[PDB]
Nucleic acid binder design. Structure first.
Ligand SMILES: [Zn+2]
Lengths: 122, 206, 37, 46, 48, 180
RNA sequence: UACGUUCGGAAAGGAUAACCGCUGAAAGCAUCUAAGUGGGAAGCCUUCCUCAAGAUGAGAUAUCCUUUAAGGGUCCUGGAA
RNA sequence: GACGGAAGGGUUUGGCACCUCGAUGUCGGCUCAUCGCAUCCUAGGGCUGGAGCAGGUCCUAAGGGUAUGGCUGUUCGCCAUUUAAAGCGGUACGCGAGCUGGGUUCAGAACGUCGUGAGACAGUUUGGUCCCUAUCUGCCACAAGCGUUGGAUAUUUGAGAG
RNA sequence: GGACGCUGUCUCAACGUGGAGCUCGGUGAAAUUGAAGUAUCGGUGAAGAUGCCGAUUACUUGUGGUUAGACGGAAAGACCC
RNA sequence: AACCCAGACCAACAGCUAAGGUCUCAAAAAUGUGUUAAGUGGAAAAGGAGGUUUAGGUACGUAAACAGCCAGGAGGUUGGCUUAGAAGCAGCCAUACCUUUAAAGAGUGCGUAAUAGCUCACUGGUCGAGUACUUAAGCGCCGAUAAUGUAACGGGGCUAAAC
């Protein structure tokens, strides 16, 4: 349940460490993004001398949320912080590695390469 | 249209074979009998009168009693409805629950839960005023009309008043399970009415 | 196309007709078609 | 990709769908070769 | 007398065969209003 | 009025015509056609010929004169020789086929069009790109040919579509005609 | 209670706007129109849902009762109201 | 579509001083809408110097929808992300006996300018009470009495309406 | 003015508690008040109609809610002259 | 209230009239001759315009007018050129170019780099008398279009119950 102004952990090795959601894409009054949705983020904090500067606007995909969402088989998975991964123009991960686990709705949202680069899929 | 008088037992969930959960509502079907018939040349239209769970013999008025004089071994029925344009049955018959065995979707009609005198914010999803910044306006209507034109409140303006209690028919409920031995139907989703209220289940229109 | 108030023939091949109560111009040069507003 | 769902009936047939004509009225409509049941929209044949 | 009711009663038969002149059959409108806002309903002679 | 309204109607020998109570029946070798005639116009059969005149001289009657003359003439030419209007299907992958009393059209759309043929009308093919509607009534023949054409109206860039054979399609250019 | 779950926004038919016709005039031609005859839309009327015979136009009908009966109300214990 | 001509709309800025000074509370914002079509998008077309795609222009059509933030009291405007599209007007420039007082429009104080001065200034900044238990009409709901032509108890056709 | 932390201020509201409101019993006002078997729309009119014209709607009478109107009540407008 | 008719001493269950009307609501009309198809009547401009009634001119004709159809629609001569190309058709000067002359313009339009090609004006047959362009008067059509509800005859309705 990421909305506008939410802070997120960037979970990849581009350089950013904190991002802020500034828009939820795909819908007119759309207010919440869930796992596997694409948001527009601004970078609020980055590793020094990186390829990603603080104050740039990118698109990102949500990989962990702290609010559980129902699955078909009745199981709910609720992480412990909200985290996203930056994307380039092709809607593919800009980075080369992903830190920590991700949720398996990326599988269905067709982010197979994010899933593969993740460490654990829950 | 095939229909039955059932009782909403409650809700539960079941596990499909591969693990997918389906939330279901359970309906229990007391025996339903055909009490009479309505004919186009005598009543103006064709329908079958269907009845359900019995009444206590101390509280059946004689008009109701005489309604069942010609029927054999059919006690008076508390819930009576009409099924328009149906055939294949006649007075004294009895409808199984299996008439839905070939049906994929159903429609259920019942009396929705009553919520009493309810305000606008619950009744019509009205937003309210702010709860701070000096506001003295929390869950009131706001403005209702215009100034001088029309110098009245239009008919149908939404205000406070009673909420709920109407009939309602919900459409295209998937049929999950039929259990003849326990006289039960399991549909997927919600069904109007409180526990123990009586619904009418019809074959879906679409 | 040229929903106008003054409908006039443009070339000598345009022709004037009246249909269901409106005045119209019909021609082979479909670019010349017209109806009164 | 969640694999492109083969456009199938509930009776195992493909739904090829066609265009009837009748009396100015042009109709696009659904058809199954297994069961020959005619409707309009393949909603009604899953 | 206009005060009181002294005239007779009338039964009209064949009321569906009244003939009109002009284009009234297509153009005469019968209006009604439900008293709700915007609830103005028209009905031409044919349909009515 | 004008000479078409008064021009006499020849009757072929094989063709019979009869008038009675605001109705006309024309029975020929190939069929029988009927028509209504309005009160203001009178139709007469004499000397193996048909004549039409008007009781009044209002403009409605003036127009009716020619209208009914022409209709009865087409009503007689039909029962003797029948009417026929033809069509051509031009374009890559466009096809027409016949099964019984219906036609199947492949016209680029993602569905193959079936087409019930109304009664009283026959359809003739020439390969799979040429059609000819034949029948007793000119009105019906024109109607059918028109509705088939409407199934896929022609276009000016390449002539693709279903065209009347007698029609001439004005043609435009696309890319290479604008070459500088 | 939704921050939840489930379902619904169709399809089809009739008359039609703009538009396109067919057969044909007035005006030997031509023309969708003047006689007719048609196609044609998130639009209109049916269709989906709710209310509805105080609709005084007060409907239809199945049964009970025939000088206070049938039946209803009050009282009391209570609800899914 | 140059230069001109003929009209509508009564929303902008005005004219006029006809209703109102024993009081018609003035600008925005929030909540709540409704109506017009001169249609922002979705729908149905005509023509293009319309190849397709993407358009331009024009006709018909108001059923539904027509965004969130930074700045400003702001209407407006600008800017950043969007969306199939982020329409134009009326209704006391909708809506204070519904809310908000930021601004406008009191008495404080200071600054700029003018006046000898007292003071003045649609010049600027700050502080600066928003009253009232609903009689009728209107509307949102539930009942009492009564009629429906014998009196009651149930099942319903349906005008009409949402 | 900006930053950090914190939060129902907001998306977005829901539930619970306490005093009123609701019913009954006792006690018991106020301002206002020419009356009234006071419907609406389209028009006209001292130029925004409960009282007029045309048309439409509406069985009779209460109670609990909400103020759109009666240019509401309160202050012989404080602004202008 | 201001326009039109008409100056109230009082009473009457008397008559004739003005303005204004005579289908009905709502006291009062019918007959004759024309127009109107738009419900115009029952709002309005410029302008567009084979609406129609009536009247009057110019073109034109029983020696074959208009329309349709069947043919010709030419040559000298790319008319002179401008221009890179103009052949009838980017454009300029005129066609005071005659000729076999049916009749054929120094070519009407479309389309061609320029031509070609397809057509027109004109003329011959077929058929057979009004046609082709204007003017005057009476009713009409589009133009005609805002917001609480048909709302610009009072309404019902009316093709006269309109003028
Ligand atoms: Zn032309």
């Amino acid at each position: 349940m990421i909305q506008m102004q939410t802070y997120l952990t960037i979970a990849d090795n581009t350089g950013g460490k904190v991002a802020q959601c500034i828009k939820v894409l795909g819908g007119s009054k759309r207010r919440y993004a869930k796992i596997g949705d694409i948001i527009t983020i601004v970078v609020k904090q980055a590793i020094p001398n990186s390829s990603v500067k603080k104050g740039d606007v990118y698109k990102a995909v949500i990989v962990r949320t702290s609010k559980e969402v129902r699955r078909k088989n009745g199981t709910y998975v609720r992480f412990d912080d909200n985290a996203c991964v930056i994307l380039d123009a092709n809607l593919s991960p800009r980075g080369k590695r992903v830190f920590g686990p991700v949720a398996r709705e990326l599988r269905d949202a067709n982010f197979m390469k994010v899933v593969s680069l993740a460490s654990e899929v829950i | 249209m095939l229909g039955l008088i059932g009782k909403k037992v409650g809700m539960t969930q079941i596990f499909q074979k591969n693990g997918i959960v389906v939330p279901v509502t359970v309906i229990e079907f007391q025996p339903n009998y055909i009490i009479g018939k309505k004919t186009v040349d005598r009543d103006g239209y064709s329908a079958l009168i269907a009845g359900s769970v019995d009444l206590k013999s101390s509280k059946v008025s004689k008009p109701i009693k005489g309604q069942y004089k010609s029927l054999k071994d059919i006690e008076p029925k508390r819930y009576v409805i009409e099924l328009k344009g149906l055939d294949g049955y006649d007075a004294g018959d009895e409808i199984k629950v299996d008439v839905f065995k070939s049906v994929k979707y159903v429609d259920v009609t019942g009396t929705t839960k009553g919520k009493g005198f309810q305000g606008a914010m619950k009744r019509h999803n009205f937003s309210g005023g702010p709860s701070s910044h000096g506001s003295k306006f929390h869950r009131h209507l706001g403005g209702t009309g215009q100034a001088t034109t029309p110098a009245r409140t239009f008919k149908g303006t939404k205000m406070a008043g009673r909420m709920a209690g109407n009939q309602q028919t919900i459409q295209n409920l998937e049929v999950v399970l039929i259990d003849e031995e326990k006289r039960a139907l399991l549909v997927k989703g919600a069904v109007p009415g409180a526990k123990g209220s009586f619904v009418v289940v019809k074959k879906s229109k679409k | 196309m040229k929903v106008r108030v003054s409908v006039k023939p443009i070339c000598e091949k345009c022709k004037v007709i009246k249909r269901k109560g409106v005045l119209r111009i019909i021609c082979d040069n479909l670019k010349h078609k017209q109806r009164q507003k | 990709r969640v694999g492109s769902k083969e456009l199938i009936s509930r009776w195992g047939g493909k739904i090829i769908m066609k265009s009837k004509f009748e009396n100015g009225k042009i109709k696009h409509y659904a058809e199954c070769q297994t069961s020959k049941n005619t409707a309009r929209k393949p909603r009604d044949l899953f | 007398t206009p005060h009181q009711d002294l005239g007779d009663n009338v039964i009209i038969i064949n009321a569906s065969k009244v003939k009109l002149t002009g284009k009234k059959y297509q153009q005469k409108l019968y209006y009604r209003h439900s008293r709700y806002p915007g609830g103005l309903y028209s009905d031409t002679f044919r349909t009515l | 009025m004008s000479r078409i309204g008064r021009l006499p109607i020849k009757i072929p020998d094989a063709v019979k015509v009869d008038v009675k109570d605001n109705l006309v029946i024309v029975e020929g070798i190939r069929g029988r056609l009927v028509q209504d005639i309005k009160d203001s116009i009178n139709v007469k059969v004499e000397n193996g010929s048909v004549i039409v005149d008007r009781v009044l001289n209002d403009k409605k009657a003036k127009a009716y004169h020619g209208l009914y003359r022409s209709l009865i003439f087409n009503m007689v030419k039909g029962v003797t020789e029948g009417f026929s209007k033809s069509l051509t299907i031009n374009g890559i992958g466009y096809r027409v086929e016949q099964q019984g009393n219906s036609l199947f059209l492949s016209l680029g759309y993602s569905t193959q069009f079936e087409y019930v043929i109304p009664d009283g009308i026959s359809v003739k093919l020439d390969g799979n790109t040429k059609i000819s509607v034949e029948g007793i009534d000119k009105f019906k023949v024109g109607q059918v040919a028109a509705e088939i054409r409407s199934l896929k109206k022609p276009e000016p860039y390449k002539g693709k579509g279903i065209k009347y054979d007698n029609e001439v399609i004005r043609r435009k250019v696309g890319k290479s005609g604008v070459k500088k």
